[model samples]
Each structure stands twice: as structure tokens, then as C-alpha cells.
Target: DPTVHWLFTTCGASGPHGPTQAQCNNAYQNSNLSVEVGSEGPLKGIQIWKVPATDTYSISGYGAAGGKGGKNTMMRSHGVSVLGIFNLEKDDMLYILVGQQGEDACPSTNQLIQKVCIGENNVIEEEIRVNRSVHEWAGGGGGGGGATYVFKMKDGVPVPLIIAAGGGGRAYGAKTDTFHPERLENNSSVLGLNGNSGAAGGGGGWNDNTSLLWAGKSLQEGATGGHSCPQAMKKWGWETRGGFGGGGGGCSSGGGGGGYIGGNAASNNDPEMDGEDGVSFISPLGILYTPALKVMEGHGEVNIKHYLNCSHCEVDECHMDPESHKVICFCDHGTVLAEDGVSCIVSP
Candidate 1:
């Protein structure tokens, strides 16, 4: 049988040097081995032992231990997730759609109360802000909803990226209760679509007022309004498509026009069209081998909530109230902050 051998041993005591393999294995197959008497080094004064080799060998090093956790009483509030990266070119751009800015509920006029009334402002401002919030948080901004699109690159750099911020909506007033005569316009990088203008204030002249009904304007080139009916049962208006805002509706006494994109508002026979959503895009040049998306920051929470309450009110009655227009609670009514330094919480 082949013989196994005792090769080396150490007590692991502190010393400049311990017993070497040769020293330990000096005696040819001996049960015990010791260094020469009084040779050259100081004694470590520790036992030396050894175990025979086994099937496997292993080695290990020191490692750090884990830490304990703590609590935070005041946690952060929830916020909309702004995408870190919106891959304009590589990924789908379905999320880019944004809604129109709230339309002015009242028609254009120079009345002092209408001009400065907090109620009127709230009706418009709150609606705008709320709609924007819904666009950003829920539906995303208009094109289809918030989305990422890639544009063709020019050189090494990304082509100019364009994001369509929604145009403001038209307002409504007492003079033209049938639905504001005019519509809010759509915004675009170039000449954009104008919102549909509401039909004439009075409803009595439908028969002869073929030219007087509400009409819509286009963003692209000269786009004409739909042909008017020879007789006046229906008031004609334009519909929004391809990034256009909807046309305004005629008075309640007359037939209302349909909404664009979504749909416009209507009263009795008149229609109240909702404005179309906005669009967004990215240049193809913007994408990279390992591209990252960066979504814009969302509007603040306190501002958003207040905006929703006042803007999308169910009862137009409250909207018409004088107290609703009070100036002291402008913030409560959802007016944008006048000064800076307002501490809005950053969404995680």
C-alpha cells in the first residue's frame, strides 16, 4: 500500500515564524516531530497539532455583519411617478397624450367683476389646473396620454425635441349662457389650431343666420368650417382632429355643435365640445445605446387637489356664486401661487 504522510503543523500562536512543513515532516513517517534543541528561534509556547487531509479543502475570509432597521414617523406623501426615462425612439409613445388647458367658462368681455372676480377666475383656473393634473397624473398629457417618441437625429446630437403644452380653454359668461360662444385654441410648435368659437349669443335667428353660427379654426393651413344648413334647425361648428381643439357650440335654443378630440359641452339644443388632447415627440437623435428617460416633475399635491375641487364642479350654480369669487381665499380657489419659495413636496 502507498503510504500517506504527516506534512505540516502549527499551534497558531503569535510569532515571527512557526514550524515549517519541512520541519514538521522531518521524521520520515513519525507519530510526532519536534524542532532541534535550542536551534535558532524563541519558543512560541503553544501546542502544535495536525489533522490528516480529507476529501475536500476550503478557505474563507472575514465578512461584515448586517445592520438593524429604524422607523420614520413622518413618511412622505404619495406623488405621480415621473418616468426617469421616456425612450422616444426605441419604446412606444402611447403615453404622450396631454389634455387641453381648461377652457374659459365665460365669453370674452371687459366687465370689471368678470375680469377680476375670483369666482370666475377659479372657474377657469381650477378647471385648467385640474384638467392638467388629470392629464399628467391619470391620462397623461394629450397626444395619446404621456408617451415617448423618437425623432430623426440630425447629427451626433438629438434633434430638437418638442412637447405640446395644452392651450388654454375659452370661458363662459352670463351674456352667453348657451355655452361660451368661442372655444379655447390648441397650441403647437408652429401655427396651432384655434379653439372653436361659440355660436352667436342669441338663438332666435337660426333661419337667416347661416353665416352667424359658431365656426372653428384649424392649426395646419386654412381649414374651413363645415357648410352651414340652408335652414336653421342646427348650428354648425368644427370638430378637432390631428391636434386640433374642438369648435364651440351654438346657443341652447339652437342645435349645439359636437365636441372635438373628446367632445364639447352642450345646452338644450347646443353642444359643449371637449377640447382635444395635446401631443409630444422626441427626435431619433436623442436615443442612445443605453438611453435613459427623464419625465418632467409633476405639479404639487395641495395645489392639484384644490384645483380639482373648484374646476370640475358638478353644479354650475356654485360656480356662478359671488362668494366663490372671493379674493382672500384665492389659494383655496386654486389660483397659481403669486410668489416663489412656496415649499411644494418633491415626489419620490
Candidate 2:
């Protein structure tokens, strides 16, 4: 016969909007009608609905921390987590395992921690690992980290798993030649040793025409930015016809423009970068397996916390909706959903 047991999944971190609002909200939104909330942190407690049933089910979730922002850019990165639950049939349990999937919350600064479920009678656990380091640009937005753990259990242990780590954000400069010189110099001249992780900053621009002389042929050919999944994140060619700007890259998707360098004059609005496609992972059954399981499903919810550098930064209120995949805000007479679920707001 199968059994019914309670389960808890949680991730922890410091919050910006005081402790109560930011931390509490993260835990609260994770619990749905089927799962009741218990203690906090990486593991929580849940109440099982009934005794043993012949049918088995699976559940999975993801957690990530926000990415750090550059000193010049006002944008800050936020982490994301997802929850999924499903039922599995008997034979399915023999060959299937849950594995971690996707990228982390932010490329350069976040990690996806493994989660465990503790019931009144037993405890189930899983582990997370990654193949490569995710990257974030020096002055631009970072890529998100990902995590996945199959929602299945055997005896008192987890079977298959899904996991992902978020990428970190990069820093950028405002004025010409003011951006980090190290990043650009290394890429343009290959002068510095390759960094194990995280990209170097772009080199500063030139003040004198003679400086261009040092560039040699490399100067004529814009340097290539760090390679992210799905996108390249590099300088474009000399003209507009050359695919505009190159894009950020990651698994499951191609890089969007923001590629090659544009001519001398490039507008901020000129075909912005696109987010990478979401990734998935699956595990093979061996260590943990249960018989007589049925079905399962899952999803995620997002929240936005606000902060300001000064009084001049005041904007409006914004809401993030998981179902619609949108973040909306209002200011004075205007209203809008952020292009990427991340937008800055200020108050007067």
C-alpha cells in the first residue's frame, strides 16, 4: 500500500523591505492549498492529507537570490523560485529520477540551494550541482539562475532531481572611456589572464587619435563580449544592417541582438537584449523509487521590493503576476508593465 505524508520546501536570505515583508511574503506565496506552512528556512513542515494510498505523486521547486547591481546603474537583480507537484504511475518510478534544471537567479551572484521536505514521520532530501559558471556583464543586467527538483519521494528519500544556478549582473560606465578599463582592455588586447568566472569590464574609450594606433587591427574589429547561453553579448559591426546589437545567451534559446558594435551613435532604445529560454533537467531512477504513483503539476509567483537612492527617484506602485507573466506600475498619470518584470520607481 502507498502512504500519505506531509512535505515542506524552503530557501532563505536577507531581505531589503525590512525582514517581515520580504521574507514572510516569500514563504507565504510558496504554500498553496495542498501544502500548509510550518517553520521557516531551507526546510519547513507540512501536514499530510491522509494515511497510505496505492498511488504515488511527485513534487518539485526552485529557489534563487537576487543579483548584485553595478555602482553606476540603478538596477538591482532579484532572485526567482518555482514549485511543481505531480503524480506518477508504478512503472514510471523504476526508470525516472528528478534532477536539477535551468540557470540560477542571476548569472554572477546567486546559487540555487538544495531543498528538503520533512514530514511528521520522515525526511526526504536532494542535492544540487552545476556544469559551468553563469556570467553577468560588468555594467548590464545579469542572467537569472535556475533550479529544479522532481516532486517525487521513495521510502523517506527523494528519487530524481532538477537544479539550476542564477547568473550574476555586470557593471557598466556612463561616460565614454569611463567604463571599467580592465574588461575592455583584456577582451580587445587579450592582455590579461582569463578569469575563472565572471567577465572582465570593457576597456575605457580613447582620448587621443594616436591611442587608436595601439589598437592595431583589433581596434577595427570590435571585441566579443562574454559568451552566455542562447546569446553572445558582444560588440556589433560598424553598420546598422549587421543584426543591430548582439544578445545575451543561455540554454534553450539563441542570443538576442546587442551583438556587434553599432556605429559611433547607438540609442538606448535600439533593440534591447532578450532573456534566455528556460532550461529543464531529468534524473534516472536507481537510489530512490516508489511504486503506485499517479499525477503532479507546479508553477511560481513573483514579487517586487522597492528601494530608492534619493528623493528624486520616486515613481509608483508595481505588481508582479506569475500567471500573466507581467509586472505593472503606476506613476502620476502613466501606467505600464515593466519590459522585464524589473523596473525602477521613485516617489516625490
Candidate 3:
């Protein structure tokens, strides 16, 4: 058994299509492998599996579904799964990177307009940035980014697994000082803690004094962002957002509050209002990924799988090489390969 199934799918050109073959055979029999749909063009790129000795598998899939911003009423999708186990050798080689979806916002470092990486033979290592879309008065509407998985073991170390960034899109204007330089706030995530920016859109009052002063706007909404280390986390209000106005009524002057993964802070003087859509992740092999939609429109996904048995080692000892695509194990005659290369023991 060579054991190295594969799969690829994309509809992010706006995606209103793609992924039906019973949903790609239900994600290839629940991540068993052998799924296809690149036809040879825009699925993204990079893929080079060839393992047998250096074990540890289980990467499940599903990520791509976030597009609908004209003032988004709803839009978001991003799912991933690493399950666990990582370490490779038998000639080690498993690049596999497939990202695309989360566009718009890089006119000048506004931040993410598109970001996706996962390397090995070429270098890179791991990345899936995507969260930056807010600029237009009531523009508190940008939050849909999360999807990352790295694993570079073999002594070189570097095993991330799944960080799940995505979530930071809300900041427009309306008083409170009016300052939305992109508003990422804290960002940063390896699953240790550092992703809280996305709240700025509450200011729409005008008149100075005259015996009728009224200055109070800013509701608050930006506290859902996510990041997990172990079982790969993602699921907390998804990105929460809703509640931007409900004050002034007499002369009119109150409506600015709602930006933190769903922008919308500032009404009364409306200009285009739009923000709120970023949240979707469910992999433990449940599959349900999606996230990336604001100006880039729709794009964000990366799925992979490579197993032969090596959660530690068992299953009769395992062995395969199919001519170089290694997956070794059958050690006994002075064994070797350990050092965490997926274990083989014996040489003490």
C-alpha cells in the first residue's frame, strides 16, 4: 500500500459553484483521500507528498466559504483539522500549501488582501493571514480570517499544527476621536494569546453647543477573535457583531457602535454601512471551512492528508517505500531512525 491519497477544490472566483460530487465524495470519504478538482489551473499551488518512514498522520480538510460584502448581512466559512501527530523522514518531503481567499486591503498595508503559505522543500513553513477590510464611515465591517497549519519536524523542529487566525474587521469613524488606521489592535497568534483588535466605529454627532450639546457614540463590538494550540480551536460567537445605534431621537444624533468582526458603527449619517462576516471552523474531521470575503470577494481554503500509521508506532510495525516515497518501520536488527524521526528504536 503506497498510501498517500490527495484532493483539491476551489470555487473562489466568487464561488457560487464547485464542490459537488456529493460534495467531493463527502470530502473523500471523510478524509480518507483521493479527491480532485484543479483541472490544472486555479486551485492555488504546491504539493509534493512522499512519506513512509517518518510517521504521524491525520490532517483532515475543508476551508473556503466567505464572500458577500455589499454590506454583508452574513458571510463566513473556514474549517481545518490536524487531529495530531507529526514527524517525518523516509526521505521526508510533504510541502502541501493551498490558500486563496481573503482579498482586498493592501492598497498600502491596510493588511491582508491575501495570505497563504505552508512549506518544506521551498522554505516558507506556515501562514494563512486574512483580516483587514474597513474604511468608509460606517465601515465597521471586516472580520473573516483564520486558517493555518504548519509542521516541519525532523530535528529542524517547527510544529504549529493549526493556529486559526482570521478575525479583525471593524473600524470606521464617528467621533470617539475618529481613528481607524486599520485597527488590528493586537493580532498575533500561535494560540498563546494576542488577537483582540477590531473595534472602532462610533462617532456621528456634529453640533457644538448653543444650549444643546450632544456627544456620545460608540457601542463596542470586537471580542470574539480566536486561536487555539492543541485540538485546534475556533468557535466563540464566531466573530460576534451587532448593536451600533439606539440613542438620540429628538434632534437626531446617536448611532455608532458595532465593529469587531462585523463592522457597523455609525448611523444617522449613513454612507454605505457594511461589516460582519468571519467565522467558520470545524475540523476534528467534521469538515466545514470558510473565511475570506470583503473586497477580494471569496477565497480561503487548504486541505491535506497523509497517513500510513505513526501516532507513535504500532500496526504491525509499518513499512512502505513505493520507490522513494518512504514510510519505514520493521526495525529490529540494530534499529535506527529515532531521535523523533517517527521512531524506530533499538540503538541504545
Name the Cα RMSD for model 1: 34.8
Tens-digit per-residue lDDT, 1-348, candidate 1: 212222212212111122233543453235532232112322111112222222211110000000000011111111111111222222211111111112122222435323423343343335345654211111100110111111123344222232222221111221122221222222323322232223311111001112333332221111112221222122212111111111222221111121221122222222111222222222232221111222222111000001112222322111122346332212324333334323222332
**Per-residue lDDT of 67 in model 1:** 8
Top lDDT prediction, candidate number: 3
What's each prediction's TM-score? Answer: 0.20, 0.25, 0.28
Greater lDDT among 2 and 3 belongs to 3
Local distance difference test, each candidate: 0.20, 0.21, 0.27
Off by over 4 Å in 2: 1-65, 72-158, 164-167, 171-280, 284-348
Mind giving the per-residue lDDT tens digits that candidate 2 earns over 1-348? Answer: 111223332223221101223343465454531322223431222111221233423333322221221122323222223222333453333211111111221223211111100112111111111312222111122222211122234685433332211111221211212121101111222121111121211111111111221110111122111233212233211010101001121211111111111111111211122122122222342112222111121111221122111222234343335367344443433443344433443333
Candidate 3: lDDT of 2? Answer: 48
Tens digits of per-residue lDDT, candidate 3, 64-160, equal 2221221222332222222333444575654332222322111212121112111111111111012122121112222222222222334653322
